From a paper:
The yeast ortholog of SGTA, Sgt2, is best understood in the context of post-translational insertion of tail-anchored (TA) proteins into the ER membrane. Sgt2 captures TA substrates after they are released from the ribosome and passes them on to the Get3 ATPase, the central targeting complex, in a process mediated by the Get4/Get5 heterodimeric scaffolding complex. Importantly for its role, Sgt2 associates with several heat-shock proteins such as Hsp104, Hsc82 (yeast ortholog of Hsp90), and Ssa1/Ssa2 (yeast orthologs of Hsp70), which can bind directly to its central TPR domain.
Two copies of the TPR domain were present in the asymmetric unit due to non-crystallographic symmetry. All Sgt2_TPR residues could be built into electron density maps in chain A and chain B. The two peptides (chains C and D) were partially occupied and were built with care. The interaction between the Sgt2_TPR and the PTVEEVD peptide from Ssa1 is mostly driven by the formation of a two-carboxylate clamp. Most of the electrostatic interactions between the TPR domain and the peptide occur in the C-terminal EEVD region and anchor the peptide in place. In the interface between chain A and D direct backbone contacts involve hydrogen bond formation between the carboxamide sidechains of Asn141 and Asn110 in Sgt2_TPR, and the sidechain and backbone of the terminal Asp7 of the Ssa1 peptide. The guanidinium group of Arg171 forms a salt-bridge with the carbonyl main chain of Asp7 and forms an additional internal contact with Tyr169. Phe178 and Tyr181 contribute to creating hydrophobic pockets and interact with the aliphatic part of the Pro1, Thr2, and Val3 residues. It likely relates to the fact that the TPR domain helices suffer a subtle contraction to enclose the peptide in the TPR groove.
Residue numbers in the entry:
A (entry chain B), C (entry chain A): 93 to 225
B (entry chain C), D (entry chain D): 1 to 7
Write the structure that this text describes.
């Protein structure tokens, strides 16, 4: 049992989770990402990926937990904030969704994709709506 | 809402 | 004439370049990016986009020059190195392409996409093919 | 590699 062998085992489980996501087997994906975390619990990507699978099943509270874990483990991994913002937005918490999406743009700057800006703008519009009435 | 692919 | 109006003018030219790229009118795209740079010459994105238009015409020496300008203006804008890596790869300079593509991975770290790693692995396979002749 | 989409 080496650090390299442990990492390779967890990475293989992550890959099985990614394949499940592509097949829209979100229930299987949650299993594989969970199993990967149990092998290697210090890798933020596995938590962000599980957040995506949870969100795909509309389990936004579970998604938020995993996104916050990703953010805690690696605050520079911006997909953590993307997952948090998507789940907060879906829960009707646009102010926290806006803060998460803005963090993505703060990290990426001029590197930000069009999708990242759109997510930020959608949350921003929703926060504006909540004030007009 | 953008549904982002896993990594 | 406000700074935002100048930026909006350059961005509209950039968008005209993006439309030209979509239509595969690469000569027109080069013009629009050039005009954007003349309106606002401090934005590395215009140079990186012009490098893409040059590369599409297989003008890789011109692409390298624009990619290097993008990198000088904005060293953390990783698409400048992606443009440099492509141009060098296409020139048959795969060690220099590998260094460019590796710099993208160093900037992005655990945020790197599968496309970025595919580019890196492609340059690496060409470097290794070369030293195995 | 490919010339990725501009911007
Ligand atoms: Zn051992
Ligand atoms: Zn199943
Ligand atoms: Zn299992
Ligand atoms: Zn980044
Ligand atoms: Zn920048
Ligand atoms: Zn024309
Ligand atoms: Zn013109
Ligand atoms: Zn020989
Ligand atoms: Zn290629």
């Amino acid at each position: 049992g080496s650090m390299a062998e442990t990492k390779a085992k967890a990475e293989d489980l992550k890959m099985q989770g990614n394949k499940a996501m592509a097949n829209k087997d979100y229930e299987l994906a949650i299993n594989k990402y969970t199993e990967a975390i149990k092998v290697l619990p210090t890798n933020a990507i596995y938590y962000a990926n599980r957040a995506a699978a949870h969100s795909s099943l509309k389990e936004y509270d579970q998604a938020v937990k995993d996104a916050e874990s990703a953010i805690s483990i690696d605050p520079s991994y911006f997909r953590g904030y993307s997952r948090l913002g998507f789940a907060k937005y879906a829960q009707g918490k646009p102010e926290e969704a806006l803060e998460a999406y803005k963090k993505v743009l703060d990290i990426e700057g001029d590197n930000a994709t069009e999708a990242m800006k759109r997510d930020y703008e959608s949350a921003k519009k929703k926060v504006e709506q909540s004030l007009n009435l | 809402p953008t549904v982002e692919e896993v990594d």
